Amino acid sequence: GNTVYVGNIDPRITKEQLYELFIQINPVLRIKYPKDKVLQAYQGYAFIEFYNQGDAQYAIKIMNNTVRLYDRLIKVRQV
Amino acid sequence: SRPGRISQELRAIMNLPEGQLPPWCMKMKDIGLPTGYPDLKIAGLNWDITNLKGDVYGKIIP
């Protein structure tokens, strides 16, 4: 319940950029940002862990379809 | 990194010039301020809009 799924992420985006963005919305505990280790390429999605379920739910409501990174509209969903 | 400021690097990526409220502004007016930052003040919401200056749009003010 404390983790959200973030999608439509341009592979140029860094974990530190995702952190700067999402700490605007609530405190962030950790980010899991899957990478193909053979190609060292991000895969278009991430998991952002907030400190509790309320804070995650708030983030989904505020951020889904709200921000474009490299012109791509970011999706935020419960997972 | 901190709530209420956005770096030049992230601003370029977001297409958010200095002096403009971030795009979640309207939704925060509807839903409320961050559940996890009780003392966050955002320019144009619960902080004077004249504080929307440079890379700053909000500040934690206890």
Numbering used by the authors:
A (entry chain A): 8 to 86
B (entry chain E): 289 to 350
Manuscript text:
Hsh49p, comprising two RRMs, forms a heterodimer with Cus1p. The structures show that the Cus1 fragment binds to the α-helical surface of Hsh49p RRM1, opposite the four-stranded β-sheet, leaving the canonical RNA-binding surface available to bind RNA. Hsh49p binds the 5′ end region of U2 snRNA via RRM1.
The Hsh49p–Cus1(290–368)p construct yielded small needle-like trigonal crystals, which diffracted to a maximum resolution of 2.7 Å, but at this point we were unable to solve the structure by molecular replacement or isomorphous replacement, partly due to twinning. The higher resolution crystal structure of RRM1–Cus1(290–368)p was used for the detailed analysis of the structure of Cus1(290–368)p and the interface between RRM1 and Cus1(290–368)p. The Cus1(290–368) domain is folded with most secondary structure elements located at its periphery, and it covers almost the entire α-helical side of RRM1. The interface between RRM1 and Cus1(290–368)p is stabilized by face-to-face hydrophobic stacking interactions. The Hsh49p RRM1–Cus1(290-368)p structure fits well into cryo-EM density of the Bact spliceosome, corroborating the biological relevance of our crystal structure.
